[PDB]
RNA sequence: UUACUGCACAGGUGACGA
DNA sequence: TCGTCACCTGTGCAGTTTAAC
C-alpha cells in the first residue's frame, strides 16, 4: 500500500543563523531587499524582517542574531528555496517565479507532431507547443507533528503563436474577432489588448479593447488559446489539421501520461540532485528521495475509502456501484412516492426542425431499443411513469435571426401556454448559432427566465445534440433523463451513508463571475446548496434563490441557523444528541466568519446538544499529484494493446499531506477516458484550523460521495454537489437578474422541490 | 445549452498577517 | 496599504466510434 508523489525530499541544515529587526511597516521591505541584493536573503513575517546572508561582503545589517531551527520554522528555508532553485538552474530562464517555472530547452511538439503525421507548412514553425516545468517547495508532514520541505514537480505546455499578424492574413486566416496580446511584457502591465477589427498595413484596429484602440502589428500577437490555434491551423491544413492535433495529442502524452510523468519527474530529481543547491555559499541543500505516501513505520499517510454505493431504496437493499446500472435495474429512489406520474412537457423548437425534434422525443420518451442498450427502455419506463404528454410549441424563427430569436421564442411560449393547461416541465431546442448570443438576445436565458418565472423548469438542448448519431445519443439521453426527472422534483438516487451522529448538515457555497465581454469588469454572485444525512442516505435539501456576493457570510449564517432550527423541530433532538455541520467551498472562509458562523449556530441549537463544525475547502489546482505504480491501467478499448489510466490511483485513495490536508483521488482508470488522457490530479481537501470537528479523512470521503450525488450526469462530478450545484445556481440567477420580466417568485413555490438548476 | 474528461489561454483573486 | 503563500474564475475546443460492464 504505497502512493508515490511528484515531489522530492529536500535535505536542509538543522539550523540557520539570521539577523532580525522589527519592521512594522511592510512598505519598507522592497527597498531593503534591493539594498542587500546578492548578499542577503530577506523575508518579512509577522512584524519582523529576517536577514539571511548568502554571500560575504557588505553591506551589513543591524539587529538581533538568532538561530532558526529548520524543523520548527521551515518557512524561512522554504522561501529561500524558491530563489535558490532558480539560481541552481541558470540556463533555464524563469517564465514565472515562486513557483520557479521554466521551459524545456529543446522540445517543441508542433514540429515533432508535423513530422510524425506527415504534414508541413511554412507557418507551422511559428506555432509552438513547449513543455513547461515548475518546481514548488512545499511544507508537508512525513508524520504528525514533524514538518519537512519537499520540492514538487509539475508539467504543463506553453502554447504560443509567434507568427506575425501580416503573415496570417496572406495565408487566408481571417483575424476578424480574434483576441490579441502584447509581445513585450512589462511588470505591472496587462497582456490582453482586445479583439481584432481590421488591419491597415502598420497597425490593427481593436474592438472590445482593454485600453488602447490601436496597436502596431509588431507589438501584438494572437493569444495562444486553443481557439486561435485551431482557427489558424485548420485554415492551413484541413481536413488534414485533425491529424496534427492527433499527433500533438500523441506528443503531449509523452510527458503527461502516468509512466511518462513519473519518468519526467524522476529525471528532474536526478538533474536537481547532481549538485548541492547553495542556499548560502557555506550552506547547502540536497534533493533526496521521492516523497511517498505509505503506512510504513510510525507513518499513517494513505487509506482507501470504500467504493461509493448508489442507493435506490430506503432500506439499502437496492444498490449499485454505478448510477446507470442501478437506475436501469431498480428505477429511481423515489419511485414509490413520486406524485406526478403523467407529466405534460412543453416542447419549444424552431418549426424547421420539426422532424428532427420528433425523432429526438420518441427516443427520449419511448427508448431506442436494444441495438442501443445504453438507452433502450425510454424515459417513461426508465423512471416508472405512466406516460409523458408533449405540448408541441413550434417557433417561427431561423438560425440567421440573431436579433429577434428570443422575442419569437417567448411570444410563442406565451401564446401556446395561454391556450393550454398547466405544464410541469419544458424542453427548449436551440440553434447552435443562438446558444451563445449576448444575454439581451439569447434565447436560452430568455426562455429559461420566462418559464422559471411561471414555475416551469426547463431542460434545454442544442440542435447538434438533437442530431447526434445513435451510438452517442443513447448516452446524452441518460443524462438528459436524469436531469429532467430531478427537474420534475424527482430523486434519481442517493449515496450510502451510515449515520454516526444524530444529525448532519452540509452546506456549500459556489461563486459565479459574470460579464458580457472580457473587457467588462466581472460581477460576482453566490449560490448555496444544502445536503442532509438521512437513514442510510444523503438527501439534497433546499437551495438558495438570492445570490449577491455582498453579505455572503451573512447568507451562509442565515441559511445554517434557519436550517438547524427546522431540523431540530422536525427531528426533536434528545438531550445529549450530537449535531454536525460541515461547510464546503473552493476558498477558505475568514477566521472572523468562522467565529461568527460557529457562534450563531451554537446558540441557535443551544446547550442541550453537542455541536461539531468543520469548514472545508476543495482545491483542484495545487502542485500535488499521486502515482500508483502498481496500477497497470485498462485497455483503451476492448482488445487493444494501448492502455488508459496507467499508474492512476484508485477512486477513493486518500493521502495525508499534513494535519489539515488530504489528497483525494477521484478519477480511476475505469473513469479515465483515453489512452492519451494525462495522469489525473487529485483534489486537495483542507480543513479550516478553527474547525471544532477535526477528522479530515472523514471529510475527504464525504466530499468523494458528494461527487457521486450529481443529477446532471450519470458519471460523477469533478467537485461535490454542494459546491457544483451552487456554482450553477449562482451563474443562472446572476444572469437572470438582468433579464427583463424575470421573477424569482416561483423558486420557493412551484419550484421549491425542483432541481431546476441542473 | 445532455454531459463527463482533458487542455489551453486570459483575467486576476482569496486567505493570513503587521 | 503592503508582505507572503496560494490558486481561483471564464471561455473555447476536442474526444475509446469519449459516455464507469
Ligand atoms: Mg443542465
Could you identify the residue whose CA is nearest to the C1' atom of nucleotide B18? Answer: A47
Residue linked to cell 540557520: A16
Could you identify the residue whose CA is nearest to the C1' atom of nucleotide C14? Answer: A245
Distance A616 CA to B13 C1' (A): 19
CA distance A711 to A725: 10
Instruction: Check if the beta carbon of residue A484 is closer than 8 Å to that of residue A711.
Output: no
In the 376-435 segment of chain A, residues within 7 Å (Cβ) of strand C are none
Q: Beta carbon of A473 within 7 Å of strand B?
A: no
Ligand 1 centroid – CA A243 distance (Å):
33
Listing DSSP states for A110-159 in one string gives: HHHHHHHHT---TTGGGEEEEEEEEEEEEEEEEETTEEEEEEEEEEEEEE
Cα distances from A613 to residues A125, A158, A603, A684, A691, in angstroms, run 57, 42, 13, 19, 6
Cα distances from A641 to residues A610, A630, A675, A745, in angstroms, run 56, 18, 10, 57
Residue A113 burial (10 A CB sphere; 0-12, 13-18, 19+): buried
Grid coordinates in use for A222?
494572437
Backbone angle region of A740, left / alpha / beta, with phi > 0 → left and psi within -120 to 50 → alpha: beta
Strand order in the sheet with A425-430: A389-395, A344-350, A425-430, A458-462
| Annotated binding residue A699 | no
CA distance A39 to A15: 19
Instruction: Check if the beta carbon of residue A556 is closer than 8 Å to that of residue A694.
Output: no
Three-class DSSP category at A196: strand
Q: How many CA atoms lie within 13 A of A118 on its CB side?
A: 2
In the 325-364 segment of chain A, residues within 7 Å (Cβ) of strand B are none
Euclidean distance between the first and the last CA atom of chain A, given in angstroms as a whole number: 38
* Strand A578-585 relative to strand A503-514, pairing: parallel
Q: Measuring from the CA of residue A684 to each C1', which nucleotide is nearest?
A: C7
Could you identify the residue whose CA is nearest to the C1' atom of nucleotide C17? Answer: A471
Q: Percentage helix, strand, coil, to 5, in chain A?
A: 30, 30, 40
CA distance A226 to A159: 8
Residue A671 burial (10 A CB sphere; 0-12, 13-18, 19+): middle
CA distance A296 to A431: 58
What would the 3-class secondary structure string for A463-478 be? HHHHCCCHHHHHHHHH
The counts of H helices and E strands in chain A are: 18, 34
Instruction: Check if the beta carbon of residue A711 is closer than 8 Å to that of residue A758.
Output: yes
Q: Beta carbon of A527 within 7 Å of strand C?
A: no
Beta bridge partners of A103: A132
**Breaks in chain A at C–N > 2.5 Å: after which residues?**
none
Grid coordinates in use for A378?
425510454
Q: How many CB atoms lie within 10 A of CB A546?
A: 15
Ligand 1 centroid – CA A392 distance (Å):
21
Three-class DSSP category at A666: coil
Ligand 1 centroid – CA A651 distance (Å):
25
Q: What is the DSSP letter of A590?
A: P
Q: Beta carbon of A407 within 7 Å of strand B?
A: no
Ligand 1 centroid – CA A428 distance (Å):
12
Q: Beta carbon of A208 within 7 Å of strand B?
A: no
In the 141-200 segment of chain A, residues within 7 Å (Cβ) of strand C are none
Distance A166 CA to C2 C1' (A): 44
Question: What does the angle CA A255 – CA A256 – CA A258 come to, to the nearest 5 degrees?
Answer: 110
Distance A587 CA to C4 C1' (A): 17
Ligand 1 centroid – CA A528 distance (Å):
17
Q: Beta carbon of A532 within 7 Å of strand B?
A: no
Residue A586 burial (10 A CB sphere; 0-12, 13-18, 19+): middle
Q: Beta carbon of A612 within 7 Å of strand C?
A: no
Backbone angle region of A551, left / alpha / beta, with phi > 0 → left and psi within -120 to 50 → alpha: left
Beta strands in A299-387 (DSSP E): 302-304, 310-311, 319-320, 344-350
Q: How many CB atoms lie within 10 A of CB A170?
A: 9
> Which contacts (CB < 8 Å, 24+ apart) does range A58-67 have?
A59/A35, A61/A19, A61/A21, A61/A36, A62/A19, A62/A21, A63/A19, A63/A20, A63/A21, A64/A19, A64/A20, A64/A21, A65/A17, A65/A18, A65/A19, A65/A20, A66/A17, A66/A18, A66/A19, A66/A20, A67/A15, A67/A16, A67/A17, A67/A18
H or E element that contains A277: strand A277-280
Q: Beta carbon of A79 within 7 Å of strand C?
A: yes
CA–centroid distance for A314 within its chain: 32
CA distance A571 to A547: 29
CA–centroid distance for A583 within its chain: 18
CA distance A152 to A26: 29
Cis amide linkage into residue A259, ω under 30° from 0: no
In the 635-654 segment of chain A, residues within 7 Å (Cβ) of strand C are 636-637, 651
Cis amide linkage into residue A694, ω under 30° from 0: no
Full residue range of the structural domain in which residue A675 is found: 494-737
CA distance A328 to A379: 10
Q: Beta carbon of A66 within 7 Å of strand B?
A: no
Residue A100 burial (10 A CB sphere; 0-12, 13-18, 19+): buried
Instruction: Check if the beta carbon of residue A556 is closer than 8 Å to that of residue A507.
Output: yes
> φ, ψ for residue A284 (rounded to 5)?
-115, 145
Backbone angle region of A178, left / alpha / beta, with phi > 0 → left and psi within -120 to 50 → alpha: beta
In the 235-274 segment of chain A, residues within 7 Å (Cβ) of strand C are 242, 245-246, 249
Ligand 1 centroid – CA A738 distance (Å):
20
* Strand A643-644 relative to strand A310-311, pairing: unpaired
Distance A3 CA to C15 C1' (A): 29
Instruction: Check if the beta carbon of residue A447 is closer than 8 Å to that of residue A428.
Output: yes
Cα distances from A264 to residues A57, A115, A198, A260, A272, in angstroms, run 39, 23, 44, 6, 12
Cα distances from A92 to residues A54, A86, A101, A367, in angstroms, run 22, 8, 9, 58
Q: What is the DSSP letter of A279?
A: E
CA distance A285 to A79: 13
Largest separation between any pair of C-alpha atoms in chain A: 90
Three-class DSSP category at A749: coil
Residues near A750 by beta carbon (within 8 Å), at least 6 away in sequence? A454, A455, A456
Nucleotides of chain C touched by protein CB (<7 A): 1-21
Ligand 1 centroid – CA A481 distance (Å):
11
Q: Measuring from the CA of residue A430 to each C1', which nucleotide is nearest?
A: B1
Residue A155 burial (10 A CB sphere; 0-12, 13-18, 19+): buried
CA distance A515 to A161: 27
Distance A110 CA to B8 C1' (A): 14
CA distance A273 to A277: 8
Distance A505 CA to C4 C1' (A): 35
Distance A595 CA to C18 C1' (A): 46
Q: Measuring from the CA of residue A588 to each C1', which nucleotide is nearest?
A: B15
Three-class DSSP category at A48: strand
In A572-617, which residue ranges form alpha helices assigned H by DSSP? 591-605
Q: Beta carbon of A588 within 7 Å of strand B?
A: yes
CA distance A493 to A538: 10
Could you identify the residue whose CA is nearest to the C1' atom of nucleotide C1? Answer: A27
CATH number assigned to the domain comprising residue A597: 3.30.420.10
Residue A220 burial (10 A CB sphere; 0-12, 13-18, 19+): buried
CA dihedral sign of residues A12, A16, A19, A24: positive
* Strand A538-543 relative to strand A578-585, pairing: unpaired
Ligand 1 centroid – CA A755 distance (Å):
10
CA distance A371 to A299: 53
Q: Beta carbon of A619 within 7 Å of strand C?
A: yes
Strand order in the sheet with A214-216: A214-216, A203-207, A192-200, A179-182, A220-222
Burial A424-436 (b: 16+ CB within 10 A, else e): bbbbbbbbeebee
Ligand 1 centroid – CA A674 distance (Å):
25
Amino acid at each position: 500500500r504505497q502512493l508515490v508523489s511528484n515531489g522530492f525530499e529536500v535535505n536542509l541544515p538543522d539550523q540557520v543563523e539570521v539577523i532580525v529587526r522589527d519592521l512594522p511597516d511592510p512598505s519598507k521591505v522592497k527597498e531593503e531587499r534591493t539594498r542587500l541584493m546578492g548578499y542577503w536573503f530577506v523575508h518579512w513575517f509577522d512584524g519582523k524582517l529576517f536577514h539571511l546572508r548568502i554571500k560575504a561582503g557588505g553591506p551589513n545589517v543591524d539587529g538581533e542574531h538568532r538561530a532558526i531551527r529548520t524543523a520548527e520554522h521551515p518557512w524561512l528555508l522554504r522561501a529561500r528555496l524558491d530563489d535558490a532553485l532558480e539560481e541552481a538552474l541558470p540556463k533555464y530562464a524563469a517564465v514565472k517565479k515562486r513557483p520557479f517555472t521554466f521551459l524545456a530547452q529543446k522540445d517543441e511538439l508542433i514540429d515533432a507532431a508535423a513530422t510524425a503525421a506527415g504534414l508541413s507548412h511554412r507557418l507551422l514553425n511559428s506555432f509552438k507547443v513547449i513543455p513547461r516545468f515548475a518546481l514548488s517547495p512545499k511544507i508537508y508532514e512525513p508524520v504528525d507533528g514533524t514538518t519537512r520541505v519537499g520540492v514538487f514537480v509539475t508539467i504543463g505546455m506553453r502554447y504560443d503563436i509567434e507568427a506575425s499578424l501580416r503573415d496570417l492574413l496572406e495565408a487566408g486566416i481571417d483575424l476578424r474577432g480574434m483576441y490579441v496580446v502584447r509581445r513585450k511584457r512589462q511588470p505591472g502591465e496587462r497582456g490582453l489588448l482586445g479583439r481584432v477589427r481590421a488591419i491597415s498595413d502598420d497597425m490593427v484596429q481593436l474592438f472590445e479593447e482593454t485600453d488602447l484602440a490601436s496597436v502596431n502589428v509588431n507589438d501584438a500577437k494572437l493569444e495562444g488559446s486553443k481557439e486561435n490555434f485551431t482557427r489558424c491551423l485548420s485554415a492551413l491544413l484541413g481536413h488534414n489539421y485533425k491529424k496534427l492535433l492527433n499527433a500533438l495529442d500523441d506528443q503531449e502524452a509523452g510527458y503527461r501520461t502516468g509512466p511518462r510523468f513519473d519518468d519526467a519527474v524522476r529525471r528532474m530529481g536526478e538533474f536537481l540532485a547532481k549538485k548541492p543547491i547553495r542556499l548560502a555559499d557555506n550552506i547547502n541543500a540536497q534533493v533526496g528521495d521521492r516523497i511517498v505516501f505509505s503506512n510504513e513505520g510510525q507513518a499513517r499517510n494513505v487509506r482507501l475509502a470504500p467504493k461509493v454505493e448508489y442507493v435506490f431504496d430506503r432500506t439499502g437493499a437496492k444498490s449499485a456501484e454505478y448510477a446507470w446500472r442501478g437506475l436501469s435495474q431498480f428505477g429511481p429512489f423515489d419511485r414509490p412516492s413520486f406524485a406526478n406520474r403523467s407529466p405534460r412537457i412543453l416542447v419549444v423548437y424552431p418549426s424547421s426542425t420539426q422532424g428532427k425534434v420528433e425523432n429526438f422525443l420518441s427516443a427520449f420518451r419511448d427508448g431506442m431499443g436494444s441495438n442501443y442498450s445504453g438507452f433502450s427502455k425510454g424515459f417513461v419506463d426508465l423512471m416508472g411513469l405512466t406516460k409523458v404528454e408533449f405540448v408541441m410549441c413550434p417557433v417561427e424563427v431561423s438560425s440567421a435571426d440573431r436579433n429577434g430569436a428570443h422575442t419569437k421564442y417567448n411570444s410563442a411560449i406565451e401564446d401556446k401556454l395561454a391556450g393550454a393547461g398547466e405544464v410541469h416541465a419544458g424542453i427548449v431546442v436551440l440553434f447552435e448559432d443562438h446558444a451563445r448570443l449576448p444575454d439581451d438576445r439569447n434565447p436560452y436565458i430568455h426562455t429559461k427566465s420566462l418559464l422559471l418565472t411561471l414555475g416551469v423548469p426547463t431542460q434545454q438542448v442544442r440542435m447538434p445534440t438533437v442530431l447526434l448519431e445513435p451510438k452517442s445519443l443513447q448516452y446524452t439521453l441518460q443524462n438528459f433523463s436524469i436531469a429532467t426527472y430531478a427537474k420534475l422534483n424527482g430523486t434519481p438516487w442517493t449515496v450510502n451513508h451510515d449515520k454516526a451522529i444524530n444529525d448532519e448538515l452540509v452546506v456549500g457555497m459556489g461563486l459565479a463571475e459574470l460579464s458580457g465581454s472580457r473587457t467588462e469588469k466581472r460581477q460576482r454572485f453566490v449560490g448555496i446548496t444544502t445536503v442532509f444525512a438521512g437513514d442510510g442516505s444523503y438527501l439534497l435539501g433546499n437551495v438558495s434563490k438570492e445570490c449577491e456576493y455582498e453579505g455572503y457570510s451573512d447568507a451562509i449564517r442565515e441559511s445554517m441557523t434557519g436550517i438547524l432550527r427546522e431540523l431540530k423541530k422536525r427531528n426533536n433532538w434528545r438531550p445529549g444528541d450530537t449535531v454536525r455541520v460541515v461547510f464546503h467551498a473552493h476558498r477558505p472562509l475568514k477566521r472572523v466568519d468562522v467565529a461568527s458562523i460557529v457562534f450563531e449556530c451554537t446558540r441557535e441549537i443551544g446547550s442541550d446538544q453537542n455541536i461539531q463544525m468543520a469548514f472545508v475547502t476543495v482545491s483542484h489546482d495545487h502542485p500535488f499529484v499521486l502515482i500508483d505504480r502498481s496500477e497497470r491501467g485498462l485497455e483503451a478499448y476492448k482488445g487493444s494493446t494501448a492502455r488508459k489510466g496507467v499508474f492512476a490511483p484508485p477512486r477513493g485513495a486518500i493521502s495525508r499531506v499534513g494535519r489539515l490536508t488530504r489528497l483525494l483521488a477521484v478519477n480511476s482508470p475505469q473513469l479515465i477516458k483515453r489512452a492519451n488522457t494525462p495522469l489525473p490530479t487529485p483534489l486537495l481537501v483542507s480543513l479550516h484550523p478553527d474547525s471544532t470537528f477535526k477528522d479530515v479523512d472523514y471529510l475527504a470521503e464525504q466530499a468523494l460521495k458528494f461527487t457521486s450525488l450529481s443529477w446532471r450526469s450519470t458519471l460523477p462530478a469533478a467537485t461535490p454537489v454542494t459546491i457544483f450545484y451552487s456554482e450553477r445556481i449562482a451563474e443562472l440567477l446572476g444572469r437572470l437578474k438582468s433579464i427583463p420580466n424575470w421573477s424569482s417568485a416561483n423558486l420557493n413555490i412551484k419550484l421549491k422541490w425542483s432541481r431546476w438548476f441542473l
